[PDB]
Write a protein that binds this ligand. Structure first.
Ligand SMILES: *[C@@H]1O[C@H](CO)[C@@H](O[C@@H]2O[C@H](CO)[C@@H](O[C@@H]3O[C@H](CO)[C@@H](O)[C@H](O)[C@@H]3O)[C@H](O)[C@H]2NC(C)=O)[C@H](O)[C@H]1NC(C)=O
Ligand SMILES: *[C@@H]1O[C@H](CO)[C@@H](O[C@@H]2O[C@H](CO)[C@@H](O)[C@H](O)[C@H]2NC(C)=O)[C@H](O)[C@H]1NC(C)=O
Ligand SMILES: *[C@@H]1O[C@H](CO)[C@@H](O[C@@H]2O[C@H](CO)[C@@H](O)[C@H](O)[C@H]2NC(C)=O)[C@H](O)[C@H]1NC(C)=O
Ligand SMILES: *[C@@H]1O[C@H](CO)[C@@H](O[C@@H]2O[C@H](CO)[C@@H](O)[C@H](O)[C@H]2NC(C)=O)[C@H](O)[C@H]1NC(C)=O
Ligand SMILES: *[C@@H]1O[C@H](CO)[C@@H](O[C@@H]2O[C@H](CO)[C@@H](O)[C@H](O)[C@H]2NC(C)=O)[C@H](O)[C@H]1NC(C)=O
Ligand SMILES: *[C@@H]1O[C@H](CO)[C@@H](O)[C@H](O)[C@H]1NC(C)=O
Ligand SMILES: *[C@@H]1O[C@H](CO)[C@@H](O)[C@H](O)[C@H]1NC(C)=O
Ligand SMILES: *[C@@H]1O[C@H](CO)[C@@H](O)[C@H](O)[C@H]1NC(C)=O
Ligand SMILES: *[C@@H]1O[C@H](CO)[C@@H](O)[C@H](O)[C@H]1NC(C)=O
Ligand SMILES: *[C@@H]1O[C@H](CO)[C@@H](O)[C@H](O)[C@H]1NC(C)=O
Ligand SMILES: *[C@@H]1O[C@H](CO)[C@@H](O)[C@H](O)[C@H]1NC(C)=O
Ligand SMILES: *[C@@H]1O[C@H](CO)[C@@H](O)[C@H](O)[C@H]1NC(C)=O
Ligand SMILES: [Ca+2]
Ligand SMILES: [Ca+2]
Ligand SMILES: [Zn+2]
Ligand SMILES: [Zn+2]
Ligand SMILES: [Zn+2]
Ligand SMILES: [Zn+2]
Lengths: 706, 706
């Protein structure tokens, strides 16, 4: 007769049933063949999910596929992309490698998509080579400042620093004709480059491995901004599409990068532009007369990529809530990969299958039904730009915004096995702290997941003292439309490596044809105990959100973030702002009001917990908690971005670490004259934050107070 | 122990306590002096509301004023606006009257703001006069087509047809230098114009009466689009403000218009341009040689209006809900007038005071506390453009959007005493039908309010047969930001006149210095029984919404509207659309899905009503009903409009009576080539509607169905 609440016996049963061996075998099946979005293998995996989730003994209440027709991009099987060194008459002097070398048994066959830059256009530019570091605006500016002619050149860049497509966008502003991208061994392999030093001998990236990836500027289907890609939909004209790289762009292996960069002529690049290819790096243009190639040689980049409409499916599954079925706890993972995608995303999908098996099995026994609905999602086409998740948020925008408690994402479950790492908005911190305190870490000692985690990623809180840190959410996976466009509190959970033992930017075989089952089984997670730890963490978070009578969301945890952003503004912008007749006084007041009201709400919750409150009273409080995140949305704040409406977490390019709209506006206004449009936009961005925080505070106050 | 529900004994108590004499006395005090927004008398009325709502025996739980600093517009007391007829050197031949004649003892004091066009700029244009009918684009085009030189002219127009500011906008596209506006006796007085025929002898407009009003293009404070006009917040630069009339504009009495128009030279105006000033109307330019003025004479319009920032307050009051205090039934009325405002808005405020007295008194007795919160609002600065209500919606956007059941507006309670009229969105129809069936009409017979209403305004429903018709909501009062911007189901209730007995565009003394207590007391509602009838209707609607366990909102009533819009599109646009490869097929499907889902939801509610459902089950259903209106919002549908996001009720300028974005896009695209940007925008607007309806249907489905 007491209202349904978190049942710790159910929780422990679930934690104890998550089976590392089942996860391993899931991963073996998921990663056995390449599974690019919209491929026949992608469709086999859609059917696998459906079959698992419709099973009468271990399935969910229901499961269904939904399909969108979306604009993807592929290279040509008939005319491969090629990078050649050519002479004055067009004779080929040297050809780069076309695809990964069959080093581990799974590469080099027609199943493997050639490396390419998805959404980069076809073309056949040819010109003198330059080296442009990470291809940031400041990198091309450095070349220009040095008197290097950029018009008509081919620019070689390394992954990292700025997004994939941005390298081509920034190049093209200087009239660069084509772009090459490689991963520098300094950036991913702790400076190692040899066959014996790299996979299959270690987790490191082999010399022929090539990061594939989306080079589109935005996320979501390119043709249908703010509308779902259902067959009938308005589509932007292929000519009116914004966000494609403007020039042909092609990624290459670091062995091919070595041949190019280590032969360049000219000035030594800055120390910060150096790497581990094996030589000092020079800037170009062109090759050095004492090197491997004639100094009149050019680089020809021939690209044959096509844009192609394709069907991509999501698979949704649901366990209906027993008491509040119109509240959703959403747990999602993308399904599609660049090649075999054993790590990305199949390590997550293997966990998705195992968690959903345990809960479905428990559901089918009659042992349990959660208080709120649990919705499981297998997203399609994430590698092309979060397409499947984005289209879902556009199609079910209102139903999701009114009803979703939180979105839990597991993309890669395991980057390595040293430590948990979690990214998320502050309302979700408390529940993942709670969950990880009560699960044992698979690593040495006898620590909980939480006590191991804090040894790797921590911060000092004025409230709690030293605690594990939560990373902020950008657009690195399918949480992006949930947090930035729908304003749903979100979390992303993984296990990862120790940054004191490696500086790798990501696990080294990311997005290559060396991301295979053996890579995980031998190196990342032998025994699969880290996959199991992530499954347990995600399962415990999910059940705490789906079953607890009072929702375990602490909106008061946002106060530290707001205060931190306010302090950075006061310290680094306050004087500049004052010079322009712009006061931070209303912002101070709004942060103080949020702090006061979120604290008072937490005290009213604590007070009510001491008795036996009515279900409706708790539902009213749970609505204030879960809908708080929505108050930071303003769809007019960032008109030059797409989907970003959350005024706390939109991309920040300004140097001050404060509210991103304010930081970016001050950066743009800084050298403009008083009374400029750019200064007026600083005031607009500041008033957008103040209004958002005042409105957030107003939702946390007692609901019938004026 | 049963959940709180509508208590008919409380309802009848309340109906029986609403006192016509108290309403009359309220109105006497409210309209005793002019009460322009931000005037000292406006502030006295703020303090009156506060005192009434804080009374410990007859007040509410709490009441508070909130103030915004907003840009208003006023004429100059030191240099009145003047319209003169002048000779070739500037000598004044004739002067028009400056303000209403002191015909009833309340006009002509310095308390009475001079007639003027609020937000029209200062200037002193002078030119030949033309007559341009209602000042529509087509009216100016007619003049141009006839070879009339419009550059540098003064254009005389009559109120009606297009909005006030639009007359000036349309004039200025043709280089007109200044605009005069009058109300034609044919349009408001059934053709009568003499002193003995008009107030104080009848309800008709005297020859010196002048309609004041906002000539701003949008609503909300002009300086703070999409942000609340609070202290130290962003204001656009006076130079970059959109929406002001581009040229000086001045309204005049019809006696002055007679002197002007009846002396024009030239071609006889079209039949539909004629009127009752007492002559055949000609077009100009200039005056006829055989008339009162030399034919070389010009009209000089000198306007000295200023823009001025002013404080304007809202007063909010609340009765906290006993069970669901986080659900709001909002009842509002504006407080500010142009002059005495006895009809507009004080007849509404008199009702607001009496209804709030009755409920507050019942509350204080301990007799009753509503299930949901009732919020009462006295809006400031509505006459300048719904400013007080709009700023409140901006300030409390999220709290209002998540929690408001409906907004009930009473602006003018009584235009006259013949019949109820109600405007609102379909989900509110069923509750006003229920209320009005159980209250007696004050008129002849022994009819209910409902059975009297259907004799005047009716329509044939395929569901219900003949029923009273509900008008649609545009931007005629403070419901505008609730419905168009927040997406809250809204209603406006008034009593009005019999259109078979008069063709008056509105009650004739609207916005003049003849809108006085005696006008109401002697002509519109002697005995105040129609005011009482509106108070009962609003009170009954309010209690049904605030107290009922199941909310009396029938979202299935939307289906008739959707189907009617679809049919208009199929009949009048289908062929044109097909000729441009645009299919209505997805629209038909989306309408069908809404119809199906809304009907099935109604059946599930009916089923649940037969038992003793759990409060949480009913809260879930009530959320689906009240939040359905929100699903029609799309803040990207109408980028050229301000605040209009609701894709059903945005302004329609296209001739086809269908979804307004679609109607408007097809009307713009019709005279463009295949494959034009205008045709692409037709498809965008169509897909916006399809997506909205599919999303609406999705929220009405069983909440855990995939
Ligand atoms: C609804 O409103 C109408 C219009 O005001 C009311 O009818 C009017 O009632 C007044 C009395 O309040 C009548 O005034 C009388 O007029 C005669 C002239 O015929 C005059 O000799 C008397 O000194 C007196 O002032 C007025 O004639 C009458 N108008 C009409 C058209 O009937 C009506 O009573 C209102 N309904 C209710 C329920 O109050
Ligand atoms: C907080 O996190 C840091 C890592 O960011 C931990 O610092 C590491 O400490 C261990 C042992 O002292 C060394 O392996 C690393 O070299 C340290 N790294 C750095 C950057 O200092 C720190 O121990 C954590 N704090 C706690 C209390 O666990
Ligand atoms: C965490 O991963 C590391 C790296 O794979 C594991 O350590 C390796 O274990 C294999 C056997 O599976 C040995 O062949 C390697 O020599 C080990 N490398 C190092 C650096 O120790 C470690 O066992 C994993 N932890 C768990 C709990 O499985
Ligand atoms: C319309 O009438 C006004 C009012 O008489 C004229 O405005 C005056 O212009 C004179 C120039 O002779 C100035 O010296 C005055 O100070 C103005 N007076 C006021 C009271 O504003 C105006 O010039 C006329 N318009 C035109 C186009 O002739
Ligand atoms: C429906 O409303 C119309 C008014 O719009 C009513 O028609 C009026 O009826 C009476 C007498 O038949 C006359 O005073 C008016 O001249 C009529 N107007 C028109 C346009 O016909 C009609 O009676 C209403 N229907 C019902 C059943 O009450
Ligand atoms: C790659 O290596 C495996 C294992 O040695 C071999 O069987 C396979 O055929 C090779 N693939 C190609 C495309 O040559
Ligand atoms: C680059 O090589 C391609 C492939 O042979 C050739 O078609 C193209 O013309 C070359 N580009 C230039 C600029 O010569
Ligand atoms: C090659 O590099 C050197 C700088 O070391 C410079 O003097 C020379 O001119 C360069 N050659 C060309 C063609 O730029
Ligand atoms: C997507 O699937 C539909 C339905 O099967 C098919 O008719 C359509 O052509 C497909 N689109 C593509 C791009 O394959
Ligand atoms: C208007 O008329 C009344 C009533 O006769 C009179 O008392 C008042 O003074 C007049 N007002 C003005 C401004 O002349
Ligand atoms: C006045 O009107 C008549 C048309 O009746 C026209 O013949 C005459 O030219 C007009 N005078 C002027 C100055 O336009
Ligand atoms: C509005 O009121 C505030 C507070 O009293 C005052 O300081 C401000 O000047 C006022 N604004 C105007 C235009 O009167
Ligand atoms: Ca889309
Ligand atoms: Ca505003
Ligand atoms: Zn991934
Ligand atoms: Zn990936
Ligand atoms: Zn009004
Ligand atoms: Zn008005």
């Amino acid at each position: 007769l007491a209202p349904q609440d978190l049942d710790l016996e159910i929780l422990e049963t679930v934690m104890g049933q998550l089976d590392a061996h089942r996860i391993r075998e899931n991963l073996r099946e998921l990663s056995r063949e390449p599974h690019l979005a919209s491929s026949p293998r992608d469709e086999d995996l859609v059917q696998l999910l459906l079959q698992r989730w419709k099973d009468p003994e271990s399935g969910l209440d229901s499961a269904e596929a939904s399909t969108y027709e979306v604009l993807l991009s592929f290279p040509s099987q008939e005319q491969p992309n090629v990078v050649d060194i050519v002479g004055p008459t067009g004779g080929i002097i040297h050809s780069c490698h076309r695809t990964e070398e069959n080093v581990t048994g799974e590469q080099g066959g027609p199943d493997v998509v050639q490396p390419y830059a998805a959404y980069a256009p076809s073309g056949t530019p040819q010109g003198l080579l330059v080296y442009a570091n990470r291809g940031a605006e400041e990198d091309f500016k450095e070349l220009q400042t040095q008197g290097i002619k950029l018009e008509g050149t081919i620019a070689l860049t390394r992954y990292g620093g700025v997004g994939r497509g941005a390298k081509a966008v920034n190049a093209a502003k200087h009239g660069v004709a084509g772009v090459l991208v490689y991963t520098d061994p300094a950036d991913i392999n702790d400076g190692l480059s040899s066959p014996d030093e790299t996979f299959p001998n270690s987790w490191y990236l082999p010399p022929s491995g090539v990061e594939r990836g989306s080079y589109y500027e935005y996320f979501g289907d390119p043709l249908t901004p703010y509308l779902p890609a259902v067959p009938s939909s308005f589509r932007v004209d292929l000519a009116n599409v914004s966000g494609f790289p403007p020039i042909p762009t092609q990624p290459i292996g670091f062995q091919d990068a070595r041949d190019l960069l280590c032969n360049l002529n000219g000035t030594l690049a800055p120390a910060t532009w150096q790497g581990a290819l094996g030589c000092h790096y020079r800037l170009g243009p062109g090759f050095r007369p004492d090197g491997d190639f004639p100094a009149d040689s050019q680089v020809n980049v021939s690209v044959y990529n096509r844009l192609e409409l394709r069907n991509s499916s999501n698979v949704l599954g649901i366990i209906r809530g027993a008491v509040e079925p119109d509240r959703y706890v959403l747990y999602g993972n993308h399904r599609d990969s660049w090649v075999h995608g054993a790590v990305d995303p199949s390590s997550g999908t293997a966990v998705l299958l195992e968690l959903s098996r345990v809960l479905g099995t428990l559901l089918k026994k009659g042992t349990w039904r959660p208080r709120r609905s649990i919705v499981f999602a297998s997203w399609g086409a994430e590698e092309f730009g979060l397409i499947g998740s984005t289209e879902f948020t556009e199609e079910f925008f209102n139903k999701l915004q009114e009803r979703t408690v939180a979105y839990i994402n597991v993309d890669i479950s395991v980057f390595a096995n040293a430590t948990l790492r979690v990214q998320g908005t502050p309302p979700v911190q408390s529940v993942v702290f709670s969950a990880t305190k009560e699960i044992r870490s698979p690593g040495p000692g006898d620590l909980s997941i939480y006590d191991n985690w804090i040894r790797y990623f921590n911060r000092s809180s004025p409230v709690y003292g030293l605690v594990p840190s939560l990373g902020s959410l950008g657009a690195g996976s399918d949480y992006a439309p949930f947090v930035h466009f729908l304003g749903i509190s979100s979390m992303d959970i993984a296990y990862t490596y120790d940054r004191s033992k490696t500086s790798a930017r990501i696990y080294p075989t990311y997005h290559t044809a060396f991301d295979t089952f053996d890579y995980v089984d031998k190196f990342l997670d032998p025994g699969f105990s880290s996959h199991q730890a992530v499954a347990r963490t995600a399962g415990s978070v999910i059940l705490r959100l789906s079953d607890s009578f009072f929702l375990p969301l602490k909106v008061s945890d946002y106060s530290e973030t707001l205060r931190s952003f306010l302090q950075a503004a006061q310290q680094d912008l306050g004087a500049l702002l004052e010079q322009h007749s712009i006061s931070l006084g209303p912002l101070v007041t709004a942060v103080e009001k949020f702090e006061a009201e979120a604290a008072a709400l937490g005290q009213r919750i604590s007070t009510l917990q001491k008795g036996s409150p009515d279900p409706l009273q708790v539902r009213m409080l749970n609505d204030q908690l879960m809908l708080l995140e929505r108050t930071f949305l303003n769809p007019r704040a960032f008109p030059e971005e797409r989907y970003y409406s959350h005024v706390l977490w939109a991309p920040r390019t300004g140097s001050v670490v404060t509210f991103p709209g304010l930081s970016n506006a001050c950066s743009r206004a800084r050298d403009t004259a008083s009374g400029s449009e750019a200064w007026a936009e600083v005031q607009r961005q500041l008033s957008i934050v103040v209004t958002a925080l005042e409105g957030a505070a107003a939702t946390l106050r007692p609901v019938a107070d004026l």
